[PDB]
């Protein structure tokens, strides 16, 4: 029933996540993304409530897709002989943060604050639903350009949240924390805070702080652009080498630099229209 119920359009992208195409739901003209993944190329599986075997990505998406979140929500999925096909939300118009930064260069602090705050709310939501994303970065963040609302994509590299150690990582090396590099061991939250550190630096600097492993192990941050003393502090605190020196999400959200954030609407007025 799938090829009848959604109207396929252009290819939006392809990579390690499969092939995403633009789509329109026939029922009510809703714009959507259709994501095809080959069964052969799924290393991590799981099983939902009703007890059937699906890719872990579907498990995790189902857990975060209730209500309004800053997460692109799963609407439906289909199994095919050799692929799995996912129907997700599609903002119209849209741009990933990587392209946005690549185009507009480093971001005014006011804008980064809105954006980063929103990311934090989304990641909190995920954690609160028992999900760990494990691959927070600019290319997994979409911007609805009209509403100013940021939205997270690309689960599995994700996992269920747990308080024990993780000894596996199939996310992005340059966003991985020193404890992963050295010891092949990390804990979800503190490793998330690291990657948010990198995210925030990316936003205000136009580029990621570390390229090689030795730079990560060293954990030392130079600023090529004018960035406020308070923003530099927050960045360095998130990028603390010892995980227990890193802030909690609460501590991040109460940090002086995170004060008087703009709402999404007004962010777009000022910065995207
Ligand atoms: C490469 C260019 N851009 C798109 C503007 C980023 C790739 C986005 C592909 N993608 C995507 C990539 C990886 C996992 C899920 C994904 O779901 C999506 C949902 C909705 C949209 Cl619009 C896009 C995705």
Structural summary, described in words:
The chain is an alpha+beta fold and 273 residues long. It has 2 domains: 1-92, Phosphorylase Kinase, domain 1, CATH 3.30.200.20; 93-273, Transferase(Phosphotransferase), domain 1 (Orthogonal Bundle). The protein has helices spanning 2-5, 56-64, 97-104, 109-128, 178-183, 188-205, 213-218, 229-238, 249-253, 264-271, and strands spanning 6-15, 18-25, 31-38, 45-47, 53-55, 74-79, 83-89, 94-96, 131-132, 141-144, 149-152, 159-160. The strands form 4 sheets. Strands 1-2-3-7-6 form a 5-stranded antiparallel sheet. A 3-stranded antiparallel sheet has the order 8-10-11. Strands 4-5 form a two-stranded antiparallel sheet. The relative contact order is 0.12. 4-(2-chloro-10H-phenoxazin-10-yl)-N,N-diethylbutan-1-amine is lined by residues 12-13, 17, 20, 33, 35, 72, 88, 90, 94-96, 142, 153-154. 4-(2-chloro-10H-phenoxazin-10-yl)-N,N-diethylbutan-1-amine (RTX) binds at residues 12-13, 17, 20, 33, 35, 72, 88, 90, 94-96, 142, 153-154. Pfam families: Pkinase (PF00069). It is an enzyme of class 2 (transferase).
